[PDB]
Design a protein around this nucleic acid. Sequence first.
DNA 1: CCATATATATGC
DNA 2: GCATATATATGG
Length: 229
Amino acid sequence: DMDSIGESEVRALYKAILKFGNLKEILDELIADGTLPVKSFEKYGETYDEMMEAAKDCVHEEEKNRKEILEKLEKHATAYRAKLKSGEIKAENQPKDNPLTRLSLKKREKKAVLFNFKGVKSLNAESLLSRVEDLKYLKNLINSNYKDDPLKFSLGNNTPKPVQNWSSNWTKEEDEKLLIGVFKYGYGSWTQIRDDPFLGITDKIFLKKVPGAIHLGRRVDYLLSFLRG
DNA sequence: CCATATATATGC
DNA sequence: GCATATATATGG
């Protein structure tokens, strides 16, 4: 009853995981500041575990489905190639929609891997899983080597790809500061990151101009994937 | 209004 | 493969 997990708790929890990753140890803070409605720590912890196992299941299903679809598409593609080569089918004016184009589009397809959870729809299973792993990795990087002063965090000799056509002058140093920002305030907390005078990126973030919120999110994902290898 | 997220077409 | 702008959807 009073400890029941409804849609509002599910959606608040989901959004909090996307900001903080594995937040089981900070439930007390998150309830106290209004991020999560009041429920027991145990219930929120159970719900976290359930939501992450459902994400894992959703991703594993999609991997399996995609694999089988591709295997079948490969065979038709292979059968279509031998006819083109044996001359049975004319290479000189093929339909837009053919076995090779079906295979190619499926291969390059990038679509959200989504599931419904306790009556809340369209939770992104990949986003959940990668954000938890990414934020764990980032926290460990900073707490292993820069625990006493996170502002000293360095990418070292790792050289990330440069941003393309950003409206601000954005270098490796800003990448470092963005990541320290994420460690301090959470993923998606771009206003707080922008406004922190210690981070020196107040004039470099644009919340037309690039980067906005979406570009910053993509850049953090890239950087943490890049560091993790 | 604000926000984030996604399918899509396009370029890199 | 990813990055982006656009149009569009949906929660706040």
